[PDB]
């Protein structure tokens, strides 16, 4: 006559960490055309509201 017993306890603790970084650079020719008046329109509002418009 043979009797057996058996126990077991497991305990697993895990940790993850994932860091992602991306930089998608897109070259459109349209964005180059819109560059033109970007700086100039700064001094079109200066001209209209601070300086004399008659010769």
């Amino acid at each position: 006559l043979r009797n057996g017993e058996s126990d077991t306890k497991r305990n697993t603790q895990s940790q993850n960490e994932m860091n992602r970084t991306g930089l998608t650079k897109q070259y459109l020719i349209d964005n180059l055309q819109k560059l033109y008046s970007m700086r100039d329109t700064i001094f079109k509002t200066y001209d209209k509201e601070c300086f004399l418009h008659i010769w």
Partner: protein
């Protein structure tokens, strides 16, 4: 005379207001205007300019 005085106010305010002039739009110190006005005021059947000042 009160009704006639009001009309003269309206009639005279129309004579003072009604003054005609021709305006040139360009850059504030663009010398092409001075040469243009000088030619236009004197006799000038034909004037030569470029596209960047269109009379329209």
């Amino acid at each position: 005379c009160d009704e006639l005085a009001e009309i003269i106010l309206s009639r005279f305010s129309l004579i003072m207001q009604s003054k005609f002039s021709k305006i040139f739009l360009s850059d504030i110190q663009d010398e092409t205007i001075n040469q243009f006005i000088n030619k236009l005021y004197n006799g000038a059947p034909f004037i030569k300019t470029d596209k960047y000042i269109d009379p329209e």
